Each structure stands twice: as C-alpha cells, then as structure tokens.
Design a protein around this ligand. Structure first.
Ligand SMILES: CCn1cnc2c(N)ncnc21
Ligand SMILES: CCn1cnc2c(N)ncnc21
Lengths: 208, 208
C-alpha cells in the first residue's frame, strides 16, 4: 500500500523557494545528484572493505544517466549503498534540517542557490527542473522502496513492486515542460564535463 | 609497541608535492580539516538515529580548535565517529588513491591546490603548514590509537597509552617554524569565519 507523510516545515519551505524563485542557472541540479551518487558509492565501497559480502548485491560501482524524451524524464542511476525505509522517512530528514535552515539563512542574506550542496541538501535542487521526483532505492538491509513527491508539502513511500535493481538508487526526474533541454545528449555532456568530473566512478550517458 | 608502514606511492607523491611546491594560500588546511570533522560528526550522528547507544561514548557533537604557542601546535578536536585500526592502516588509503591520482592530474594540467577537498583528500593539506602531524582517534568498535607522520614516505600506528578521549579525533599539527601565524586568535577567527561556517556543529576556539 501507500503511506503519505508531511515534509518537515523547513524542507517544505526550501522546496517552495526552489520551485518558485525565478533562477536561471538550473543546470546545477545535475552535478548535485551526481555528487550524491558519488557519496553513496564511496559508502558501499568503504563498507565492503571490511565485509566483501556487502557487494553480493552487485560488484559494479557506476552512475548512469538515462534521458527519455517520450516520458520526458531524466533518470540518475547509481549502484551505491541505497536507502532504507527509515532513511526515506525520518533519518535523512533529521540530518537535513540544520543544513536546510542554514541555507535559508544564506539565501535571504546574500548567497546564491548554487551553494545548496555545501549545506548537504543538494538533492532538492531537482525541483529546479522537475515537477515530480520519483526515487527507487534498495539497501542490503531492507526492501526496495519508491519515494515520490511533487512538493506542495508531502511525500509518499510504498514498497516497490516492479523490476528489482539489487542495490542502489534511481532518481527519476519528471521534468517541467520548459526544462526539456536536459534530455539532450550534448546539453548533458556539457554539464557533466563542466561541473562534476573530479570524482571518480564511471559516469555513462545512455543515448536514445 | 609501534608499527611502521609505507604510504601508497601516490599518497607519498601527493605529500611531497604539498610539502615542497611553494604555495601561498596555505590557510585552506584549516577549512579542509574542519570539513573532515564536520563529516565525522554527521556519520556518528546518522548512526545514532537507529542506535542511541553509539552515543554512550559521548553526547556532545562539537569541534574544538586549540592553539599552543609553547609546543607550537594547533590541534583540531572533534567528537565524530573516529577511526579504527583498519581505517588508519588500509581502508582510508584505498578510498584515497583515486582522489589522489586524479588530483595529481589536475595539478599538473592546470588547477590549483585549493581544490584538494573536492577530491576527498583534504587531510593532506595539513602538510602545507605542519612538519609532523599526530592523530589521536577512537571509534566505538576499537582501541584508541595514535597515527603519526612527518612524511618522507612512512607512518606509524601505536595503540594510544595516554589520556582517553571516549570517541573522536584530535589532529595535532606540529607547525613548521615559519607557519606560527596559525597559532594566533584573530588569524584563526578570520579563516574560520572566511571559509568553513556553513556546516554546522559548534566550532569553539580555545584562547591561551
Ligand atoms: C543523502 C541521501 N541520499 C541522497 N541521494 C542518495 C543516493 N543516490 N543514494 C544514497 N543516499 C542518498
Ligand atoms: C576521511 C577520514 N578522516 C579524516 N579526518 C577524519 C576525522 N577527523 N574523523 C574521522 N575520519 C576522518
């Protein structure tokens, strides 16, 4: 079945600022989520150094970028450590609150939105370009789940019925109608080469 | 007793470049290590969300900066997750190698040293200002250890005899003789306010 939850009020308010506030360097959402995938991979790798059996769910450590003009979605796939039910419901929220509140301070007090990842809340930069975000995720210790929000204050969590992925995370961006440039091959290569490309696992772009 | 180990050749070569290569924005070492402390704290906090008993070794989550003109040392203390014997010997090394090799690519191919933390190897920026670095560390699952290097290719690891700290990490910088400006109160406040001060735990400076 499906459970509906409210965002914490500060995450709710950050999400409203991102959605509305007119801002035209929206391409940063992609380095932020590639960066989140990098971290996830570092974590399952690190864990696998004292327990090779954590990799039983997959040896491959990579990030895939999969545009789809027909569904109008850009998907970021990584084979990182994934996320548990408590992560999606309570735990990531709690860790996010301070980063959030602080970021909202830096926003109304000078600084620009490109600095979201410096406060550990880059994930929400998805809402620059996406109307709905769907996250399919699987951690060694837990079931596969789907998390979904279109913002406006709430989110859903159901255990995921569909195709098993073994371990990792798949962020599905349902792109706003004026944001389709991010489904184009060379738009994508340009950003990926531009920003993120220090770290550090293979980033493969799937051509349609 | 004391065990002596060789650095991996790429860490050895990064450490030589940092030590020698004349470079005059050396104040970045401090945001890099404050940033490492921030991460450590995020990790023990995150872990404590599904197991409050991880905090049995200390509820306080903070970073202390302790200059000492007499011993000529600047110490960074955090009550983060700390580091185990395998972390100091094998595990952090392994995770560092790619970041390292890549950073050395960016160094001889344009980019400047301020970008060390972007490759997850900021810790080594200590050697801009320190001749010897001593690290006292304690993880819930392991004994207290001391790690020490003056570079030139090797490092030591002994189980730490002295004053128990409960949990966390204490980075002791034995400052080079021309680097004593980093023992001054307002030098320290200036850098700490300048760079790092988005995230996100209390940073307390101890006055002598
Ligand atoms: C910070 C939480 N978080 C955000 N993105 C991810 C991810 N792709 N994999 C695992 N955890 C994540
Ligand atoms: C990346 C490894 N690492 C570097 N610094 C620390 C630290 N203070 N506490 C825990 N781990 C650390």
């Amino acid at each position: 079945h499906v459970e509906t939850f409210a965002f914490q009020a500060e995450i709710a308010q950050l999400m409203s600022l991102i959605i509305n506030t007119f801002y035209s360097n929206k391409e940063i959402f992609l380095r932020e989520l590639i960066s989140n995938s990098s971290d996830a991979l570092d974590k399952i790798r690190y864990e696998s150094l004292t327990d090779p059996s954590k990799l039983d769910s997959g040896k491959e450590l990579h990030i895939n970028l999969i545009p789809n003009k027909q569904d109008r979605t850009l998907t970021i796939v990584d084979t990182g450590i994934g996320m548990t039910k408590a992560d999606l419901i309570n735990n990531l929220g709690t860790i996010a609150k301070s980063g959030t509140k602080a970021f909202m301070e830096a926003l109304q007090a000078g600084a620009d939105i490109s600095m979201i990842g410096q406060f550990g809340v880059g994930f929400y930069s998805a809402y620059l370009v996406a109307e709905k975000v769907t996250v399919i995720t699987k951690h060694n210790d837990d079931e596969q789940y789907a998390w979904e929000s279109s913002a406006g204050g709430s989110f859903t969590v159901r255990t995921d019925t569909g195709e098993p992925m073994g371990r990792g995370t798949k962020v599905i961006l349902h792109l706003k109608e004026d944001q389709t440039e991010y489904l184009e091959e060379r738009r994508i290569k340009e950003i990926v080469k531009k920003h993120s490309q220090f770290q550090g696992y293979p980033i493969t772009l799937f051509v349609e």
